[PDB]
C-alpha cells in the first residue's frame, strides 16, 4: 500500500519513449514485485525493457571479449578487466529478471501462453548467463536453461498451433540454445525444421501473420547458415 502500481506502468512507457530502458526496466521490476499478474501490455513492457537492457551488455560483451583474445599483456589486461566489469553488469540484469520470473511471473500466470512465454524468457536469460558463464558452475546454468526451455516447449507442443509466434520463437531460441550453448549441431536443426515444417502446414491459416512469418524466416535463416 506503500505505492502506486499504475503510475509505475506509466513511468515505464514514458521511459520507453525517451529510450531510457535502464529506467524502463526498473519501473517494470517495481510493477512485477507488486504481486498482481502482468497484463499483456505490462508483460511486454517488461520483456522489452529487460531484453533491451541485457541486450546492450551482451553485445558490448562480445565486442570486448573478442578484441581481448586478438590482442592476447598490459594491453590485454586492459580489455580483460573491462569484459569482467560488463560481465557482472550483465550477470546482474539476468539475476533480477530470473528472480522476477521464478518468484513472481511464472508461478503467477494462468494463460498457458503466459506459462510458456515467461518460461521461454527463463530459458533465455539463463542462456545469456551461460554465454558469459565461465568455469565449473557453467554446466549448471546451461542445464537450468535446457530444462526451462523444455518445460516450455512441451507446454506449447501441447497447447499452441505450430503457427503461433510465441511457440515458433520458443522453438527458435531453443534450437539456438542447442547449437551455440550445448554444442549440439545435431539437435540444433532437429527442432528448427520440425517447428518450421509444422508451421508451414497451417501457414494458410494465420493477425499472427507477420510475426509468424518473421520468425519462420529466422527459423529458416538459421537452418540455412547452420
Amino acid at each position: 500500500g506503500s505505492m502506486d502500481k499504475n503510475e509505475l506502468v506509466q513511468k515505464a512507457k514514458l521511459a520507453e519513449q525517451a529510450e531510457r530502458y535502464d529506467d524502463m526496466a526498473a519501473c517494470m521490476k517495481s510493477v512485477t514485485e507488486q504481486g498482481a499478474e502482468l497484463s499483456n501490455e505490462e508483460r511486454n513492457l517488461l520483456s522489452v525493457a529487460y531484453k533491451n537492457v541485457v541486450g546492450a551488455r551482451r553485445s558490448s560483451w562480445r565486442v570486448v571479449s573478442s578484441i581481448e583474445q586478438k590482442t592476447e599483456e598490459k594491453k590485454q589486461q586492459m580489455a580483460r578487466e573491462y569484459r569482467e566489469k560488463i560481465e557482472t553488469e550483465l550477470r546482474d540484469i539476468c539475476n533480477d529478471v530470473l528472480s522476477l520470473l521464478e518468484k513472481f511471473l511464472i508461478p503467477n500466470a494462468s494463460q498457458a501462453e503466459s506459462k510458456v512465454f515467461y518460461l521461454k524468457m527463463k530459458g533465455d536469460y539463463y542462456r545469456y548467463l551461460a554465454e558469459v558463464a565461465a568455469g565449473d558452475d557453467k554446466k549448471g546454468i546451461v542445464d537450468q536453461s535446457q530444462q526451462a526451455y523444455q518445460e516450455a516447449f512441451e507446454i506449447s507442443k501441447k497447447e499452441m498451433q505450430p503457427t503461433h509466434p510465441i511457440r515458433l520463437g520458443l522453438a527458435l531460441n531453443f534450437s539456438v540454445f542447442y547449437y551455440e550453448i550445448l554444442n549440439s549441431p545435431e539437435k540444433a536443426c532437429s527442432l528448427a525444421k520440425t517447428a518450421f515444417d509444422e508451421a508451414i502446414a497451417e501457414l494458410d491459416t494465420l493477425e499472427s501473420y507477420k510475426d509468424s512469418t518473421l520468425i519462420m524466416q529466422l527459423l529458416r535463416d538459421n537452418l540455412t547458415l547452420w
Binding site: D124, N173, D221, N222
Partner: peptide, 7 residues
Amino acid sequence: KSATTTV
C-alpha cells in the same frame, strides 16, 4: 552468431 526472438 545465431538468430533469436526480438520484438
